Design a binder for this molecule. Sequence first.
Ligand SMILES: O=C(O)[C@H]1O[C@@H](O)[C@H](O)[C@@H](O)[C@@H]1O
Length: 378
Amino acid sequence: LRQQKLVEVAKGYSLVTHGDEQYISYYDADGYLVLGKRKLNSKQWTLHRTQYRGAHNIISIMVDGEGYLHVSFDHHGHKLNYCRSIAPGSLELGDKMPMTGVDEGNVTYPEFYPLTDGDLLFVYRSGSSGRGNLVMNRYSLKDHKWARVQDVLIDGEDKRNAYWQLYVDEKGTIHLSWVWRETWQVETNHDLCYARSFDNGVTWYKSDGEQYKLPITASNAEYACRIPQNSELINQTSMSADAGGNPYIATYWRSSDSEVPQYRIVWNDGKTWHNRQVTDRKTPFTLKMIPVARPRIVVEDGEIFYIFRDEERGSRVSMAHTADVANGKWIVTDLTDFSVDAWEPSHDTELWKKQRKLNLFVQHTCPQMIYVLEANTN
Ligand SMILES: O=C(O)[C@H]1O[C@@H](O)[C@H](O)[C@@H](O)[C@@H]1O
């Protein structure tokens, strides 16, 4: 036990590195939104209880190129809740403020991403039409303002909803993938679709270089994988990309000849889509507490670290690792030797891109101690 560390934060009911500091956000026992930071390679957190008290309880944070922390949280799912630190490096937040002042009345699932040269992307689920719709904004560091990038990017044309995940790669390309859902029931999830943008969201492409004419519907979407309804396909997972801009999507579903849903990796190598089963599960479950977690991935030129949690492994924090997604065997290990129950993984996206260090937000999930697990990957 030389390498890996389980670093205490504090007890609670995202995680992002900027420079040599790691920031964290969580709700304490009294329901207050807390912002914290540490120097990397130390275990001392500075923890700041904010003035804000808590699509139930979601917090997204990101630091811009000037070092300001941007924070958005979703409690009630109505008006946008968005704040910014008072100064570079500060954990103190200002008053709530608008972004564009348009379509900010029915906001859930806020998400920030970094863009090239210190700008930020913001994506949220807008309910102002009556159904969830992906709305995308950009924060320009040179004029210190938010602008709308797309009002309608994925269009379910009154027949369906979309559940998306995004990743901004090390070259500044925005990757987007999603599943469709036909009705209120989770069993009506189907398919995995893809798009990417090289120009901060103005123009979108398929992986084969064909340009989309927006909006993207079920008819014109690129299908990374055709997966029918009633396949135990989960919605709202995650995706990543390697340094070469190839996308990787982590999710799970059941093949038509099995009763057992399996973790999957779906990726495009520049020529075609592939998918591969990640572990060798034996225990059936249906979505119609889910016994497995939505997965997270980090990648290094085809080498994958695939983080999950499964009742078959005692609900530990688990990892599947392959040296090469195309040809190598998966090695499956547990990063903890204790159960974290209903935990789902999240990781410090920026720390992996900048330093190739994998840090996970770990907490026993039904006040429980929050930890940063510093995993070994090389
Ligand atoms: O240069 C920047 O600010 C950002 O550029 C983005 O494309 C990268 O994904 C992010 O890791 C960088 O921090």
